[PDB]
């Protein structure tokens, strides 16, 4: 009863075609949906559905028996290994010494690589007399019999109890190795090794095998720290050692919240004199305690200076956008912005001052983009958003547009472009002039209204017309029906133009009609009227779509050569930068780039750059006067300050630019207060032990994510951005089952690690239904067991409208208290020293209290009373009450006011507080902290905390000695001052 051979034996009785559906039906679905609920998600298999149900029902009732058992499918036609060691010794040398019997000899001394593998050097000779000669491989078996491997996680969050392990490999066959393995000490984390003594231990490795030696460390400081293990063998002369770098990340999540963005322009705005502009400080009502914050002030001399400078540099082009790129339109970062950037620089003749050498680099970037984009192509030149999906009309037309715009820069194959135009015109355009879309919706303007969907055809047809407006003389001999398609599309747009209710449709349709010269009269009036405040085309509830609509409308205005309605639209488009200096989605950044770039077609009485921007920063001691001029290599200047303040900026002179004020801080792990346009629930539940896990894994758990759209229709494109907990990684088997099976629930996964905090897992969803919850679950494996784990984040957001989001956090929440790594040793007292002062082992006198209290840093000395205790899984909050200010600090506080002290979780057991007990506490002016509620004293290495026994219990033996000392302390700190 192996029940695997039964499964495969039953699979072997279906036709070879349409045979995968029974295989995927036999699979254990991790999101344990019944057969009839999985047959709802199967796409194209009509006979497959019945087959999927037949086999699913089968194996499911064969699983109802037998409570070692093997229940995995044995598949076929899959190659196993890749990632072989990188090649080296790639050089061209020649022989030019006198030959010996016609054979020249040259000796070349080389350095072997640090890899344990069998290299095989291949040689080829080319002689201009005796021709060519391919040599035999010279096999070099590089081997080492004692090799030490250090296993540490990807990143560890501060104050976590992780157990790294040093695996020792012994390949000696006749010898059982006795070796002394030692962990070196680093003051940046509490290890079993200190400065007082080493942590060296003697172990014995069996022959032809390994041994794992564990070390538990507690990171105390954020940054890249050195984990170094030394191994010295106890018999031979082999001494090996490993020194790896472990990065320790802060306790929250990184945020680059945009403080404000202000258009720097003294001529059209700022009236008399010149423009003054106040910039507020940041919110930071949730900044993680004891974390730094950096404010980057960015001065763009022109509206499109940073976007170009980033579009040229390779290792900076992907910083324009805060969302991943794993789909047909998203990948277009590799082309579009670099394309319009190079064109903007060509039209304005700026490569001379900027640097000619970079142009070709940009072109190579475009080449790479083009290469990447070719991966989404189907037969007959049709582009789908994801492989194994129906080709989309919108994406195909958009790729046509970008490619036809790119034929000027790099070599674009006319077969793909022309075949795509042919696919669009011939297959997707109906004699109605309407373009059909038989794929899932990508843009939320592609789905339109329901009972009347007239505008649904309007927006798509206008977009495809904009696409074909730039492939006029580029692709025509292959597809000669471009004037007729433009005719029919423009006719459908110009006929049903008075049926448009949304401002986006009006915008993009107006630009499509203006490109042909058909925007005039009632269409012109109707178009310009909808613009609210005559500087933005917007709809409530769709935020980035308003940036797109304003961009398309600006292109319509520049197409009509109208130079009156533009400056307000430029001022509005320049101040929509919400996610860093750039924008959220791809389409927003692209269209704003195109429009703001094409406002500088020529210089027809247009503003030339010569600004005199002075900034009075409170953190700095003097004014800061930046002067960016035209005909300068860098139209960009930036400064950085490590203190968050609200500074005043004063622009002057002639020139229109941008002031981007962005900060960087770490927010706490609290779930979203108000989730705008998304419902999201995340739960994590442990998996059974007997259920098999990978070998290196220690514990396996199930992660379940359930989301729902709150809109009137289904969401069009959604991202699940899951940041893993420390030491965790997803099970790629389940991800493969969900992304590639017949019952599809995931478009594709990524695991796109950008080297920021913990590694992320991006999941792509074609849609999120509003009629139900799109639950999906998968296994997560903990390869390093961690205690005091800080929770992980799961942020959902719509790709083309980032304000539709919901950020939730998940945690196992183990029961009633904290299980840490065994605290008996000094490894623990070391960790607990960090978060509150240390007492001399009950040898505490009031004279000592006076010393430590009369330190020059001691700003406040309070007598608190523990009112409330709200402890979380990342930071415990003690809502205290001041009963008497024995020494008030730099912050005014009244007797009886509450102050909420924050403490790290790792210190909870070290403090062991009880509610409604008196306490003596003191600290520094640095202990005060900026949050709201304005109750922020961080209990740190300088915060004295001691339980004050009440008057009724001073009649006990262990208390009176402390009571009298505390009273003498109080009066000796009120009546008598400090002499130090």
């Amino acid at each position, epitope marked *: 009863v192996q029940l695997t051979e039964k499964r495969m034996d039953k699979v072997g009785k279906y036709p070879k075609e349409l045979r995968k559906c029974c295989e995927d039906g036999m699979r254990e679905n991790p999101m344990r949906f019944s057969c009839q609920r999985r047959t709802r998600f199967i796409s194209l298999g009509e006979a497959c559905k019945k087959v999927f149900l037949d086999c699913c029902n089968y194996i499911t009732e064969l699983r109802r028996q037998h409570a070692l058992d093997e229940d995995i499918i044995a598949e076929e036609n899959i190659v196993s290994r890749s990632e072989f060691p990188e090649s080296w010794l790639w050089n061209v040398e020649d022989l030019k010494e006198p030959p010996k019997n016609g054979i020249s000899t040259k000796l070349m001394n080389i350095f072997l690589k640090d890899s344990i593998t069998t290299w095989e050097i291949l040689a080829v000779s080319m002689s201009d007399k005796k021709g060519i000669c391919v040599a035999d491989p010279f096999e070099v078996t590089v081997m080492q*019999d004692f090799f030490i491997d250090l296993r540490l996680p990807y990143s560890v969050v501060r104050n976590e109890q992780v157990e790294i392990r040093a695996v020792l490999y012994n390949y*000696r066959q006749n*010898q059982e190795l006795k070796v002394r393995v030692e962990l070196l000490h680093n003051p940046a984390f509490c290890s079993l090794a200190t400065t007082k003594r080493r942590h060296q231990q003697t172990v014995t490795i069996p022959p032809k095998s390994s041994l794992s030696v564990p070390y538990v460390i507690v990171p105390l400081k954020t940054g890249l720290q050195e984990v170094e293990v030394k191994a010295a063998v106890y*018999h*031979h*002369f*082999i*001494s090996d050692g490993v020194r790896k770098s472990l990065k320790v990340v802060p306790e929250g999540i990184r945020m680059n919240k945009t403080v404000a963005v202000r258009t720097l322009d003294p001529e059209r705005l700022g009236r008399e004199g010149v423009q003054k502009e106040d910039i507020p400080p940041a919110d930071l009502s949730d900044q993680v305690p004891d974390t730094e914050s950096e404010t980057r002030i960015l001065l763009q001399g022109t509206p499109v200076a940073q976007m170009t400078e980033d579009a040229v540099d390779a290792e900076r082009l992907k910083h324009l956008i805060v969302t991943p790129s794993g789909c047909g339109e998203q990948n277009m970062i590799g082309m579009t912005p670099t394309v319009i950037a190079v064109h903007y620089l060509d039209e304005t003749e700026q490569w001379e001052k900027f640097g000619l050498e970079k142009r070709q680099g940009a072109l190579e970037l475009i080449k790479k983009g083009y290469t990447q984009q070719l991966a989404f192509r189907q037969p007959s030149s049709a582009f789908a958003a994801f492989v194994k999906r129906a080709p989309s009309t919108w994406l195909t037309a958009y790729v046509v547009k970008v490619f036809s715009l790119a034929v000027n820069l790099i070599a674009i194959d006319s077969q793909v472009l022309c075949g795509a135009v042919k696919w669009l015109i011939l297959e997707k355009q109906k004699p109605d002039g309407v373009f059909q879309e038989d794929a899932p919706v990508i843009h939320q303007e592609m789905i339109g209204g329901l009972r009347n969907n007239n505008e649904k055809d309007m927006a798509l047809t206008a977009f495809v017309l904009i696409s074909l407006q730039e492939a006029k003389d580029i692709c025509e001999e292959q597809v000669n029906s471009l004037p007729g398609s433009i005719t029919k599309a423009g006719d459908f747009l110009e006929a049903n133009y008075m049926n448009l209710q949304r401002s986006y449709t009006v915008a993009i349709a107006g630009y499509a009609l203006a490109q042909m010269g058909r925007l005039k009269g009632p269409l012109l009036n109707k178009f310009l009227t909808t613009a609210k405040d005559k500087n933005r085309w917007e709809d409530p509830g769709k935020q980035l779509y308003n940036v797109e609509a304003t961009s398309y409308a600006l292109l319509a205005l520049l197409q009509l050569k109208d130079f009156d309605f533009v400056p307000p639209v430029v001022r509005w488009l320049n101040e929509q930068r919400y996610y860093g200096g750039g924008y959220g989605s791809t389409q927003a950044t692209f269209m704003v780039f195109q429009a703001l770039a094409q406002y500088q077609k020529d210089a027809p009485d247009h503003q030339e750059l010569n600004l005199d921007v002075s900034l009075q920063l409170p953190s700095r001691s003097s004014k800061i006067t930046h002067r960016i001029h035209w005909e300068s290599a860098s139209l960009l200047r930036s400064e950085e300050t490590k203190e968050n303040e609200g500074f005043t900026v004063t622009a002057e002179g002639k020139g229109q630019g941008t002031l981007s004020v962005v900060t960087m801080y770490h927010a706490k792990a609290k779930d979203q207060l108000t989730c705008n346009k998304f419902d999201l629930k995340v739960t994590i539940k442990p998996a059974p032990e007997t259920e098999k896990r990978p070998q290196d894994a220690k514990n396996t758990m199930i992660l379940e994510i359930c989301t729902r759209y709150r809109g009137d229709q289904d969401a069009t494109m959604s991202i699940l951005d899951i940041s893993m907990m420390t030491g965790f990684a997803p099970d790629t088997d389940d991800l493969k089952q969900l992304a590639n099976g017949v019952d599809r629930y995931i478009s594709k996964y990524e695991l796109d690690k950008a080297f920021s905090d913990r590694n992320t897992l991006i999941i792509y969803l074609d849609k999120v239904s509003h009629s139900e919850d799109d639950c999906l679950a998968f296994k997560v494996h903990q390869y390093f067991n961690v205690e005091l784990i800080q929770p992980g984040a799961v942020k959902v957001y719509a790709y083309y409208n980032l304000e539709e989001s919901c950020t939730r956090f998940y945690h196992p929440e183990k029961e009633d208290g904290k299980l840490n790594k065994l605290c008996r040793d000094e490894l623990c007292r070391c960790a607990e020293e960090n978060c509150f002062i240390q007492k001399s082992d009950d040898k505490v006198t009031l004279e000592e209290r006076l010393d430590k209290a009369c330190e020059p840093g001691v700003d406040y000395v309070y007598k608190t009373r523990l009112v409330k205790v709200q402890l979380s899984n990342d930071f415990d909050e003690y809502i205290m009450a001041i009963e008497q200010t024995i020494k008030s600090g730099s912050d005014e506080v009244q007797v009886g006011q509450q102050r909420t002290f924050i403490s790290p979780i790792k210190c909870r057991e070290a403090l062991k507080l009880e509610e409604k007990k008196h306490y003596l506490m003191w600290g520094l002016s640095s202990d005060f902290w900026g949050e709201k509620p304005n109750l922020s004293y961080i209990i740190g290495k300088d915060t004295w905390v001691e339980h004050w026994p009440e008057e009724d219990e001073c009649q006990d033996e262990e208390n009176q000695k402390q009571c009298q000392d505390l009273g003498a302390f109080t009066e000796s700190m009120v009546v008598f001052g400090c002499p130090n």
Partner: nanobody, 123 residues
Framework: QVQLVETGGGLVQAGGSLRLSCAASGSIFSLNAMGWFRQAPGKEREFVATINRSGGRTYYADSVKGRFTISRDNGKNMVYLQMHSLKPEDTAIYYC????????????????WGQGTQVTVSS
């Protein structure tokens, strides 16, 4: 790789002393084990002394436990074997051997050897 040339031997008095210098023709660093071996006529290839890559760890055979002292100067690429309190039974051909670092007391883990030098201790 490296080849070795031994010198400093010869004939010596019954209880005198002499130092054997082992010259290397390459790089002596990264050579974990550097060992002196002797072979007397009518004897198996036996072990004398080995020194670590930086010194400190020294292995000696019981027959020369306190009478001999092996040293090395990595800067000059030289290994030295000082022989104090000689015995007539020490008459042998003393070789200098480059090794791997594995099991230095045995002679199977030394892939490079020298020429040798004759030391005759007359009674």
């Amino acid at each position: 790789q490296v080849q070795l040339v031994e010198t400093g031997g010869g004939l010596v008095q019954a209880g005198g002393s002499l130092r054997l210098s082992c010259a290397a023709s390459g790089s002596i660093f990264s050579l974990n084990a550097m060992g002196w071996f002797r072979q007397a006529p009518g004897k198996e290839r036996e072990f004398v002394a080995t020194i670590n890559r930086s010194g400190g760890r020294t292995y000696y055979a019981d027959s020369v436990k306190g009478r001999f002292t092996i040293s090395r100067d990595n800067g000059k690429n030289m290994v030295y074997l000082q022989m104090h309190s000689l015995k007539p039974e020490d008459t042998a051909i003393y070789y200098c051997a480059a090794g791997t670092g594995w099991s230095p007391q045995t002679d199977n883990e030394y892939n490079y050897w020298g020429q040798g030098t004759q030391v005759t201790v007359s009674s």
